[PDB]
Design a protein around this ligand. Structure first.
Ligand SMILES: Nc1nc2c(ncn2[C@@H]2O[C@H](COP(=O)(O)OP(=O)(O)NP(=O)(O)O)[C@@H](O)[C@H]2O)c(=O)[nH]1
Ligand SMILES: [Mg+2]
Length: 240
């Protein structure tokens, strides 16, 4: 059984049950979420948050792991990956160790993880988005969510949270677009959503006990809702 689900706030559990329900009615009774990102960005910490338990390794400084948990006839399987940067360049080994582990699997969602609290995208970020396109295909971005960790960050000086985070995520979506060399046509129709994650224990709980963003909202319920939505978005899943 899924022990982490029993830890969640009454209100998170309730919402998750509602969301797996919408999938179950379409005959989906399992889904596989791949997690990809540059090293250091909180991929493993987002997976522990989602799973509700300490399942993958978390560190400042080989080889992909999968974590399946089941609840009420539904199975979430989430693949944590080694980071894709051996700085200051793309780590092509980690990136085909990942493909090795994915052969014969169906990936329903990609959580592309980066940090909110960063002031710029660079050429390495575009190199990473091209190394992902060269490995899984253009098609993977029709199945992607941009997850931005460190969501509780307060910018200095004093552009607002909402200026900072709209520019940050605008810059990252443009880097995905350019590195992907997707055409304007497939890109709007891909409409890749941006969900926010705060994995810190210092993280504001709202008044229903759920991990909340600055705007008030339970972020794990939003993350599972946007995942459920991409799992259901009627664009086709990725095989290999
Ligand atoms: N404030 C804050 N710290 C975070 C967040 N997510 C991760 N961290 C911190 O960032 C460090 C690296 O996190 P980790 O989960 O290992 O990221 P990763 O992408 O798995 N790294 P790698 O791929 O190299 O394994 C840890 O000290 C962890 O607590 C977040 O949302 N907020
Ligand atoms: Mg990790």
């Amino acid at each position: 059984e899924w022990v982490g689900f029993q830890q969640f706030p009454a209100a998170t559990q309730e919402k998750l049950i509602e969301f797996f329900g919408k999938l179950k009615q379409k005959d989906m009774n399992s889904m596989t979420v791949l997690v990809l990102g540059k090293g250091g960005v909180g991929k493993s910490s987002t997976v522990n948050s989602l799973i509700g338990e300490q399942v993958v390794r978390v560190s400042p400084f080989l080889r992909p792991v999968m974590v399946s948990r089941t609840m009420g006839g539904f199975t979430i399987n989430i693949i944590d990956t080694p980071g894709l940067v051996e700085a200051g360049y793309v780590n092509h080994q980690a990136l085909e160790l990942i493909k090795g582990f994915l052969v014969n699997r169906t990936i329903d969602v990609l959580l592309y993880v980066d940090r909110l609290d960063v002031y710029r995208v660079d050429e390495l970020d575009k190199q990473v988005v091209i190394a992902i396109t060269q490995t899984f295909g253009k098609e993977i971005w029709c199945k992607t969510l941009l997850v931005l960790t460190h969501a509780q960050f307060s910018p200095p000086d004093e552009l607002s949270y909402e200026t900072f985070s709209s520019k940050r995520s605008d810059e990252l979506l443009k880097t995905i677009r350019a590195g992907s060399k997707m055409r304007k046509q497939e890109f709007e129709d891909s409409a890749i959503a941006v969900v926010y994650a705060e994995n810190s224990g210092r993280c504001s709980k709202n008044d229903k006990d759920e991990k909340a963003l600055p705007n008030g909202e339970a972020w794990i319920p939003n993350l599972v809702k946007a995942i459920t939505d991409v799992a259901t978005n009627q664009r086709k899943a990725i095989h290999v």
